[PDB]
JSON list of C-alpha atoms in Angstrom, two decimals:
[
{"chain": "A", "resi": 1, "resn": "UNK", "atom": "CA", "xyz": [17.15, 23.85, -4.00]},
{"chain": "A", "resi": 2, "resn": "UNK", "atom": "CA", "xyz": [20.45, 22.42, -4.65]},
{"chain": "A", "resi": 3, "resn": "UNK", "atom": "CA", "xyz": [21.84, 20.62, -1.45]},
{"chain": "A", "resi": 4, "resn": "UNK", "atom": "CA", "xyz": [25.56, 22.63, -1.16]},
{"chain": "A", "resi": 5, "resn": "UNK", "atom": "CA", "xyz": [28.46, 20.20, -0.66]},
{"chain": "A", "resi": 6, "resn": "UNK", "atom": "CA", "xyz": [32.15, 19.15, -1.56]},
{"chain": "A", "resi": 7, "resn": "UNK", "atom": "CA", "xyz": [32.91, 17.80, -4.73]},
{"chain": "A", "resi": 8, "resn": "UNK", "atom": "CA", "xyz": [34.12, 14.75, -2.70]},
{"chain": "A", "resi": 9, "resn": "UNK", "atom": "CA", "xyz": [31.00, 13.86, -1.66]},
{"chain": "A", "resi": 10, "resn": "UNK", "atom": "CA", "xyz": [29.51, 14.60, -5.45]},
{"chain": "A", "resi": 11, "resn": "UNK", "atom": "CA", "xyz": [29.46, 10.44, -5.41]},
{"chain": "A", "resi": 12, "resn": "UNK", "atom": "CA", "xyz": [27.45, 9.84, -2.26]},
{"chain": "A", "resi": 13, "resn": "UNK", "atom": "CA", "xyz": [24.70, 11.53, -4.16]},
{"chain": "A", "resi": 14, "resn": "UNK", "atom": "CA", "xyz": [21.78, 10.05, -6.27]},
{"chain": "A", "resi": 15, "resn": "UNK", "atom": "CA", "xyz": [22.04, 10.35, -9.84]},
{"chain": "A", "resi": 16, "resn": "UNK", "atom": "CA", "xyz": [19.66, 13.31, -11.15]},
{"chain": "A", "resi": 17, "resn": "UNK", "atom": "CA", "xyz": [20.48, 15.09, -8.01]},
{"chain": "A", "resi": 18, "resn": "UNK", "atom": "CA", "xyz": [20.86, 19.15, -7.81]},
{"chain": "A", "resi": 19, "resn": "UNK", "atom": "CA", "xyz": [23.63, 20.26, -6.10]},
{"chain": "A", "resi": 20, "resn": "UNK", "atom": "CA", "xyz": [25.71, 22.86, -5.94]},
{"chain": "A", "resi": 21, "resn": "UNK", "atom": "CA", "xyz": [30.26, 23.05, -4.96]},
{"chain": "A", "resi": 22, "resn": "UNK", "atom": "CA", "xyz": [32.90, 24.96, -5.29]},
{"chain": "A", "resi": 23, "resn": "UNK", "atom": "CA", "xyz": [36.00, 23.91, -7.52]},
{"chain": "A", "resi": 24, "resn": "UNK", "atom": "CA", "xyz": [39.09, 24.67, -8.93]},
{"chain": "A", "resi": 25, "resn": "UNK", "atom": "CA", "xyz": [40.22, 24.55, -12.68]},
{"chain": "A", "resi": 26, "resn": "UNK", "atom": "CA", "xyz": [42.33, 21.96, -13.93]},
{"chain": "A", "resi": 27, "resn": "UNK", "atom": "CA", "xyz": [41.12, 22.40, -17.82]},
{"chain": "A", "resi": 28, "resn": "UNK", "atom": "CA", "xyz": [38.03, 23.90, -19.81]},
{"chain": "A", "resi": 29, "resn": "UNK", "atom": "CA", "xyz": [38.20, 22.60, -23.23]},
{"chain": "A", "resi": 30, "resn": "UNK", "atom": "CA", "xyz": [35.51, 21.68, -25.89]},
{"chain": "A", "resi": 31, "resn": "UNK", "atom": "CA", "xyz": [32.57, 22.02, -23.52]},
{"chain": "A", "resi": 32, "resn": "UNK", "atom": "CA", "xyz": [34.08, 20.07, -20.37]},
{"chain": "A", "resi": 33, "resn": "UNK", "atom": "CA", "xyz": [35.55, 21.93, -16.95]},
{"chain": "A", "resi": 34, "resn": "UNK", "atom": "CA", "xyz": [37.65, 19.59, -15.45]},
{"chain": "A", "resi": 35, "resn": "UNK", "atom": "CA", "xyz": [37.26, 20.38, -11.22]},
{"chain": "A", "resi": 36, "resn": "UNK", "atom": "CA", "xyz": [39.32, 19.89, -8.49]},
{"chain": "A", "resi": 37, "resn": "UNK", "atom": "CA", "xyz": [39.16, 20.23, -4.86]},
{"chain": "A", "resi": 38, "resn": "UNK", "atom": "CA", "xyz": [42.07, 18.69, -3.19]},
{"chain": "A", "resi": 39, "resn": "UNK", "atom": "CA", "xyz": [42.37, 15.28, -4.23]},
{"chain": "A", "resi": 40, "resn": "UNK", "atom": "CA", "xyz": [39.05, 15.10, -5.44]},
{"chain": "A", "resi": 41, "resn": "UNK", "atom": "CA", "xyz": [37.38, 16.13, -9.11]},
{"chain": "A", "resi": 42, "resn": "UNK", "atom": "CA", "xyz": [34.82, 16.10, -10.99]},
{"chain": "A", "resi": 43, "resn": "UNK", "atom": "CA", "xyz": [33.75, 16.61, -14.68]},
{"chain": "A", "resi": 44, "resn": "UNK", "atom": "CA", "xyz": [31.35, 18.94, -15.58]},
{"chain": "A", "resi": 45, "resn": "UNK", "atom": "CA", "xyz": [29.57, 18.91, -18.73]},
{"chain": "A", "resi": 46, "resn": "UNK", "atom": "CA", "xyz": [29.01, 23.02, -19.66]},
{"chain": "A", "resi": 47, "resn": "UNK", "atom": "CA", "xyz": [26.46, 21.76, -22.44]},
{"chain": "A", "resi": 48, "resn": "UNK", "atom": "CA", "xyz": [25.57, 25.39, -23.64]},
{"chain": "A", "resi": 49, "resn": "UNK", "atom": "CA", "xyz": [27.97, 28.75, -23.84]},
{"chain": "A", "resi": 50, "resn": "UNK", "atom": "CA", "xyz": [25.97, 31.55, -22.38]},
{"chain": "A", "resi": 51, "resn": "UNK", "atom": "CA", "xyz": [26.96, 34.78, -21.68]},
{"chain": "A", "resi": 52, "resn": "UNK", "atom": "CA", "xyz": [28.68, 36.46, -18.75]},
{"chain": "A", "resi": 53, "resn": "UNK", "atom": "CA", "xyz": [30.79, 33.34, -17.24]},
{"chain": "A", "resi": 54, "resn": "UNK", "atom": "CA", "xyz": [34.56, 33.72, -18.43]},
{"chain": "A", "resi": 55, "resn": "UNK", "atom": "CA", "xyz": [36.66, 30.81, -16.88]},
{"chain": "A", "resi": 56, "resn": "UNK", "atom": "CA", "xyz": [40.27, 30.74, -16.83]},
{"chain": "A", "resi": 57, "resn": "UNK", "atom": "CA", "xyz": [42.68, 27.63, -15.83]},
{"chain": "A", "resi": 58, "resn": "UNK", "atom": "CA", "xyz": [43.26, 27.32, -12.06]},
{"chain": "A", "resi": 59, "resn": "UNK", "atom": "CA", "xyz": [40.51, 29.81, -11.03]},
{"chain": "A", "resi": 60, "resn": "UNK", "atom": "CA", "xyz": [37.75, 28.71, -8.17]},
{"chain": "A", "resi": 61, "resn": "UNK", "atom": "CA", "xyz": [34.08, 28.48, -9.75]},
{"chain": "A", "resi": 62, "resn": "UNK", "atom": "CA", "xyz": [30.39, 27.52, -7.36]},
{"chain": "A", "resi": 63, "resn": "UNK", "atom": "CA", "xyz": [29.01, 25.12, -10.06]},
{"chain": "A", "resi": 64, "resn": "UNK", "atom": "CA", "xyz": [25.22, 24.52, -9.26]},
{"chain": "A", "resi": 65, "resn": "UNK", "atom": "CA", "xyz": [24.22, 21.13, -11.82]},
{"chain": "A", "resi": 66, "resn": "UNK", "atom": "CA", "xyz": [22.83, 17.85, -11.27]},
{"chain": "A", "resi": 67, "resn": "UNK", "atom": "CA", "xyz": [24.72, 14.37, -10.98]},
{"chain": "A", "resi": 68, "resn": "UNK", "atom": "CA", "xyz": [24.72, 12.74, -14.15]},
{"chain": "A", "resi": 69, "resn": "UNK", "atom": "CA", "xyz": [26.51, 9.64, -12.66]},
{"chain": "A", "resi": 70, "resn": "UNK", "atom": "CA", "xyz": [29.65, 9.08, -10.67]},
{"chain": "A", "resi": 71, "resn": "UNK", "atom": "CA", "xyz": [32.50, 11.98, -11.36]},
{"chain": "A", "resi": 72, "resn": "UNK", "atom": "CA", "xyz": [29.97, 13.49, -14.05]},
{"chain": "A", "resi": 73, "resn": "UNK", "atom": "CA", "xyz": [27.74, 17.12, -13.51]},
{"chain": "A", "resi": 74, "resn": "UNK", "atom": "CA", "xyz": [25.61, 18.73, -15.96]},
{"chain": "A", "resi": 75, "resn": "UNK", "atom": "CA", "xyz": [25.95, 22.35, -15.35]},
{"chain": "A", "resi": 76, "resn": "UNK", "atom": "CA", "xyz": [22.90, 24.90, -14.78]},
{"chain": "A", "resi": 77, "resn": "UNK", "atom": "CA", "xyz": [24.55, 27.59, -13.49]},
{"chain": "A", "resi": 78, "resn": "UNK", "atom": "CA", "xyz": [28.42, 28.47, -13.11]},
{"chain": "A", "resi": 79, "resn": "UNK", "atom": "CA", "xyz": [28.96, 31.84, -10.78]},
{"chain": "A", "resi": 80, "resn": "UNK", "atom": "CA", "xyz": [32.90, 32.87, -9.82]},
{"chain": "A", "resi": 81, "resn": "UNK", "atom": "CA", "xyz": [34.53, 32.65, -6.85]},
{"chain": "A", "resi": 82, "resn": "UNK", "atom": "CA", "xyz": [37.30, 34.85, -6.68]},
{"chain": "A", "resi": 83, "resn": "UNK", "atom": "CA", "xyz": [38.84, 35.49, -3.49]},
{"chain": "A", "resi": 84, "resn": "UNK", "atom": "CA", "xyz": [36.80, 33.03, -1.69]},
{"chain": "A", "resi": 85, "resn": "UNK", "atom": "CA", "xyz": [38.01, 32.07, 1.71]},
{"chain": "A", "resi": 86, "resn": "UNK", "atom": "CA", "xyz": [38.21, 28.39, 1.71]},
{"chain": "A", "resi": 87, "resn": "UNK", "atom": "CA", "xyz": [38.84, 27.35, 4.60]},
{"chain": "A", "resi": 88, "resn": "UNK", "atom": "CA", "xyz": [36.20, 29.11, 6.26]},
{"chain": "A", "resi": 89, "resn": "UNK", "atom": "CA", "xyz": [33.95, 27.95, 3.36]},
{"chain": "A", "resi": 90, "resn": "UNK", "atom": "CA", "xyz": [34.65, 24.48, 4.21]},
{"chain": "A", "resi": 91, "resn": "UNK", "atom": "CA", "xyz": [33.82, 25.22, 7.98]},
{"chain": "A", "resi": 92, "resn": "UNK", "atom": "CA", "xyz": [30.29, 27.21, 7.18]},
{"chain": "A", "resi": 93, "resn": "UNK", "atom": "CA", "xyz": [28.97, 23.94, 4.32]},
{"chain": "A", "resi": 94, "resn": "UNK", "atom": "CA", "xyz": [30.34, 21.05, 7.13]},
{"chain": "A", "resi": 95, "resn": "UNK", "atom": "CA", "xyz": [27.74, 23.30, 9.85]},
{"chain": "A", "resi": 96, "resn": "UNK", "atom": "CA", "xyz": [25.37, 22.89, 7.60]},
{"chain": "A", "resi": 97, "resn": "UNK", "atom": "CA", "xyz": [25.66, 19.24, 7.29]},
{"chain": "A", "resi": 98, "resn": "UNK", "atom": "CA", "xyz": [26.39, 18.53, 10.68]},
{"chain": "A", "resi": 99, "resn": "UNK", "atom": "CA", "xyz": [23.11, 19.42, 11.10]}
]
């Protein structure tokens, strides 16, 4: 069960860590999806092309991987996100944390 949080808190986490956040596209080239959420990112290494996940610059993706190290994912599992609603995204994970 991957604990669900923002990319900028990706760092408070321990390294081997499953977690699981949403992110925008800055770049997907040669196996690496460069993420951004505000002025956060994070790189996420998309070891293995399997089928079904098309990515395209600047669209939102919910990653699920585990923390390599600081600012680096490995990816399990990469689902879409189009048309999420962010900001009440950002309001349902912080209720989660806040408890």
């Amino acid at each position: 069960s991957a604990k669900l949080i923002f990319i900028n808190q990706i760092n408070d986490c321990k390294d081997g860590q499953k977690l699981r956040f949403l992110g925008c596209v800055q770049s997907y080239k040669n196996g690496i999806l460069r993420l951004i959420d505000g002025s956060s990112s994070v790189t996420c290494d998309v070891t293995v092309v399997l089928p079904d996940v098309s990515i395209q610059k600047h669209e939102w993706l919910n990653i699920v991987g585990r923390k390599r190290q600081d600012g680096i994912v490995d990816v399990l599992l990469i689902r879409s996100a189009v048309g999420i609603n962010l900001p009440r995204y950002r309001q349902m994970v912080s209720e989660r944390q806040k408890c």
